[PDB]
Amino acid sequence: KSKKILIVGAGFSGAVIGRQLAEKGHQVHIIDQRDHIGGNSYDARDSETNVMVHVYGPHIFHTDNETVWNYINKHAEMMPYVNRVKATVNGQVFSLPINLHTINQFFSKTCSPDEARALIAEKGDSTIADPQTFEEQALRFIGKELYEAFFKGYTIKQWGMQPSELPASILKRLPVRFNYDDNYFNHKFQGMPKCGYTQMIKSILNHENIKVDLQREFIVDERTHYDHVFYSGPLDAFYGYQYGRLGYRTLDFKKFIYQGDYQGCAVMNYCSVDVPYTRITEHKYFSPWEQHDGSVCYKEYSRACEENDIPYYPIRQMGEMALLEKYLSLAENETNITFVGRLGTYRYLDMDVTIAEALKTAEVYLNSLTDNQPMPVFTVSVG
């Protein structure tokens, strides 16, 4: 039997869940409160320059998950693109993430890989048994100089907290590289959709069993008209923020246009705390197969997400997780709804991860129909 399915959000989570269910006979209704599909992966062209802008931040696809990679290759033409980030600090321009070139330039050396290991082991404090803070992780592995140049001010700008108050886990993600590889991501598959993500999501959304209504906020009354609801909007919002708002950072993107090449690369970080934006992005460099004389650029600023700002990065410290636990115990009591995605589960999720989880969620739901088991509220852990 064909089921009636409400899906709240037309970003990757809604779109991929909808597509998998559509293809199996169910009637899928996808709503989104914005006037366009795509969620935070949405891109659109700038009128004047015709530059394709990644509206809610640069979005670089990267994955080791070949199943996911083949899936999106069914919906776009993936162009090779290797993200290579630069940084300006101390009157110089460096390569990130920290590599043998960054090391040799910063200390004015011509170390080989093994000489650079010895120079960095010497700067690091191997007396720290198990770093508990971001700061201690930097002192342990990269040393004071590298830390204060590349990480301290930059991290303070992103998080609005001292690094001695942030977990080690943030920097554990980012080892020093003792060769000349300056690819930002190590994933086996990396690229950018030739006609953009909006178009990719449009192809995912393109089926006979899917109706998509925009400018349409979810209404708690609707649930009864459907067999199941998939919700990728904010968890706290669905509960009227009755216990408080989940803490996020937000970003302000300050637009400017330049005639020519403003910086010569897609991403420039500004490591100094005394430079108020975290970075400048030059969006035409995200589509190097195209040529554009005019250029759309953004200065990006980080700050605490207030009531009417878009939530970007979830903060997820003790207070935030105590608040989450309260919404979760409301959530565990529900029937015929599943909360999914970055907003629905209060997790930062890359595009490929979001896709893989959306495929699994559809599969769980389909399996639950044929086994006549109830569909759980979450198909992922958040304890």
Ligand X SMILES: Cc1cc2nc3c(=O)[nH]c(=O)nc-3n(C[C@H](O)[C@H](O)[C@H](O)COP(=O)(O)OP(=O)(O)OC[C@H]3O[C@@H](n4cnc5c(N)ncnc54)[C@H](O)[C@@H]3O)c2cc1C
Ligand Y SMILES: Cc1cc2nc3c(=O)[nH]c(=O)nc-3n(C[C@H](O)[C@H](O)[C@H](O)COP(=O)(O)O)c2cc1C
Residue 340 CA to residue 348 CA, distance in Å, equals 12
* Smaller CB separation from a copy of itself, 73 or 367: 73
x/- mask, ligand X, residues 243-282, rule CB under 6 A, reads: --------x-------------------------------
96: partner contacted, choices a copy of itself, ligand Y, ligand X, none (Cβ within 5-8 A by kind): ligand Y
Site membership for ligand X, residue 338 (CB under 6 A): no
With CB under 8 A as the contact rule, which of the stretches 24-32, 76-84, 315-323, 371-379 interacts with a copy of itself?
76-84
Of residues 360, 365, 363, the one with CA closest to residue 376:
365
Q: Figure out which of the listed residues 26, 59, 177, 283 binds ligand Y, where binding follows CB under 6 A.
A: 177
C-alpha dihedral, 217 to 221 to 224 to 227, nearest 10°: 20
186: partner contacted, choices ligand X, a copy of itself, ligand Y, none (Cβ within 5-8 A by kind): ligand Y
Q: Shortest gap between Cβ of 126 and ligand Y (angstroms)?
A: 20
Q: Shortest gap between Cβ of 182 and ligand X (angstroms)?
A: 16
Which are the catalytic amino acids? 173, 177, 249, 279, 300, 348, 350
Residue 111 CA to residue 104 CA, distance in Å, equals 6
Site membership for ligand X, residue 332 (CB under 6 A): no
* 279 marked as binding residue: yes
| Count of chain residues binding a copy of itself (CB under 8 A) | 28
Residue with tokens 């015709």: 50
Site membership for ligand Y, residue 159 (CB under 6 A): yes
* 349 marked as binding residue: yes
Angle at 64 between CA 268 and CA 210, to 5 degrees: 95
Residue 36 CA to residue 81 CA, distance in Å, equals 26
Interface positions, 295-314, toward ligand X (CB under 6 A): 312-313
Q: Figure out which of the listed residues 4, 67, 77, 80 binds a copy of itself, where binding follows CB under 8 A.
A: 80
| Amino acid (1-letter code) at residue 150 | F
x/- mask, ligand Y, residues 308-337, rule CB under 6 A, reads: -----x-x----------------------
* 313 marked as binding residue: yes
Site membership for ligand X, residue 97 (CB under 6 A): no
Site membership for ligand Y, residue 151 (CB under 6 A): yes
With CB under 6 A as the contact rule, which of the stretches 26-34, 135-143, 145-153, 186-194 interacts with ligand X?
26-34
Residue 140 CA to residue 130 CA, distance in Å, equals 9
Site membership for ligand Y, residue 171 (CB under 6 A): yes
* 352 marked as binding residue: yes
82: partner contacted, choices ligand Y, ligand X, a copy of itself, none (Cβ within 5-8 A by kind): a copy of itself
Site membership for ligand X, residue 143 (CB under 6 A): no
Task: Give the binding site for ligand Y (CB under 6 A).
Answer: 96-98, 150-151, 154-155, 158-159, 170-171, 175, 177, 185-186, 249, 269, 278, 313, 315, 348
Task: Give the binding site for a copy of itself (CB under 8 A).
Answer: 80, 82, 84, 86, 88, 91-93, 95, 100-101, 104-105, 108, 110, 112-114, 178-181, 260-265
Task: Give the binding site for ligand X (CB under 6 A).
Answer: 8-14, 31-34, 39-41, 57-61, 217-218, 232-233, 237, 251, 312-313, 341-343, 349-352, 354
